[PDB]
Amino acid sequence: ATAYTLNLANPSASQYSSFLDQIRNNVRDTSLIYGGTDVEVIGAPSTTDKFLRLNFQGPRGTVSLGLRRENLYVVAYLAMDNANVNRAYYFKNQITSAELTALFPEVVVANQKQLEYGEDYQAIEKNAKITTGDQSRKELGLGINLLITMIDGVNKKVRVVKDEARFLLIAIQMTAEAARFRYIQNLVTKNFPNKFDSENKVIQFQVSWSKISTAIFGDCKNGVFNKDYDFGFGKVRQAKDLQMGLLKYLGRPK
């Protein structure tokens, strides 16, 4: 229903940051305070407003992303094919035809296609056909200019799973992940708008969202963890050092 647009025609660091804040502010429950921190926390699941639409506006067209408001998981994407026909591709276990019709009204039922692979990084990465290093998303790098290049691969083009998968990897990280982790946001704005190398720390943050959220929710007092934690990149005792942007909903603080 609700939609936010990122103007990639005339991108600026401030616009990107405000865009992420709009996502955070949309899904958060301001009454939720985890571990005595000021970090935004996603609110309880809604049965009336389940999805959020993100529009990547470019000079040659617009590609859209659909995310679940309850956890920021990707559910689908919209892009015009080589015949300028709007088409929506979705993950079966994430959304239905009726909901997809409401999310992307410009796409007719016949043009709704269920993706052949899973929504997890592993499944998408295998279809991305990355041939160097560990062959994971880390090998693609990050950045505004990279996102623009990836969009060109799906915008008004014949669907190629390799290009589609690569677009999803970058789009998910530049939106959902950047919303959750300020460290990721800061890397993007620091190198704005250039493409740059990703890091082990970037991946380490992503795989430990739940662990980090659980730690702040139930083992943290006034921003200080009750015991040292290590999520892969070193010992942390203060939640502030994690530079979190959005915590997973785990219920209300006890």
Side-chain angles (χ1 to χ4, degrees):
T2 301
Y4 297 114
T5 300
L6 182 58
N7 191 339
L8 292 173
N10 283 292
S12 76
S14 65
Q15 288 171 21
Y16 177 68
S17 297
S18 64
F19 171 73
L20 295 178
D21 279 336
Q22 287 185 302
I23 297 178
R24 295 175 180 136
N25 290 335
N26 179 88
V27 303
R28 77 180 291 183
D29 177 347
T30 56
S31 73
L32 290 178
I33 297 176
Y34 282 12
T37 70
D38 67 336
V39 60
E40 304 88 335
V41 181
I42 298 179
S46 178
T47 53
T48 55
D49 194 7
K50 310 173 63 177
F51 312 95
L52 184 67
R53 176 175 174 163
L54 303 181
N55 301 135
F56 297 125
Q57 186 178 258
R60 295 153 300 293
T62 301
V63 171
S64 302
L65 238 191
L67 280 60
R68 269 192 173 280
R69 292 183 66 255
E70 74 169 301
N71 52 29
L72 292 191
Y73 285 1
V74 172
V75 308
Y77 87 93
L78 161 58
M80 281 187 194
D81 68 355
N82 53 299
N84 289 337
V85 172
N86 285 130
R87 293 185 178 281
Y89 307 87
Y90 68 100
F91 292 112
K92 189 59 183 295
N93 58 301
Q94 298 296 322
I95 191 166
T96 70
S97 181
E99 298 176 321
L100 195 58
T101 286
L103 182 60
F104 300 138
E106 56 267 86
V107 176
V108 302
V109 180
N111 291 340
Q112 295 179 163
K113 182 181 176 56
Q114 178 191 314
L115 292 175
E116 310 95 306
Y117 51 98
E119 63 291 315
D120 57 283
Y121 280 132
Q122 289 291 330
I124 302 176
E125 285 170 340
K126 295 201 174 186
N127 289 280
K129 301 245 66 285
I130 305 169
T131 56
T132 53
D134 60 15
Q135 307 184 168
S136 74
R137 64 199 179 276
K138 181 177 169 288
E139 198 63 13
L140 299 177
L142 292 168
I144 288 298
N145 284 347
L146 180 61
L147 177 58
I148 293 175
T149 300
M150 291 305 106
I151 289 171
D152 283 321
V154 302
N155 178 225
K156 296 174 182 178
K157 300 292 189 65
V158 181
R159 181 188 179 238
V160 176
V161 302
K162 175 183 64 65
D163 293 322
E164 167 185 89
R166 292 175 181 211
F167 156 70
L168 284 176
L169 289 174
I170 301 306
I172 296 173
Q173 296 181 275
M174 294 294 286
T175 58
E177 303 295 6
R180 294 171 179 128
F181 309 104
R182 291 197 52 89
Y183 180 76
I184 295 180
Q185 172 184 167
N186 293 348
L187 276 181
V188 176
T189 64
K190 175 187 172 186
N191 294 287
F192 206 94
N194 304 311
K195 178 205 302 185
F196 57 95
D197 303 322
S198 183
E199 316 165 349
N200 287 322
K201 185 171 177 177
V202 168
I203 304 303
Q204 289 165 342
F205 263 126
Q206 296 175 192
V207 305
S208 64
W209 187 47
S210 298
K211 293 183 179 181
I212 293 175
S213 296
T214 300
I216 296 177
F217 179 62
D219 201 41
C220 185
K221 224 300 170 185
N222 296 329
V224 182
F225 291 118
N226 294 144
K227 68 196 64 178
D228 292 316
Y229 276 91
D230 192 327
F231 303 100
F233 47 92
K235 300 169 67 68
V236 294
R237 176 55 71 125
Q238 290 199 71
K240 68 180 182 186
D241 299 338
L242 295 173
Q243 301 177 122
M244 294 303 290
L246 197 58
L247 301 184
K248 187 181 181 181
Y249 179 71
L250 297 167
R252 84 87 167 296
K254 311 292 181 291

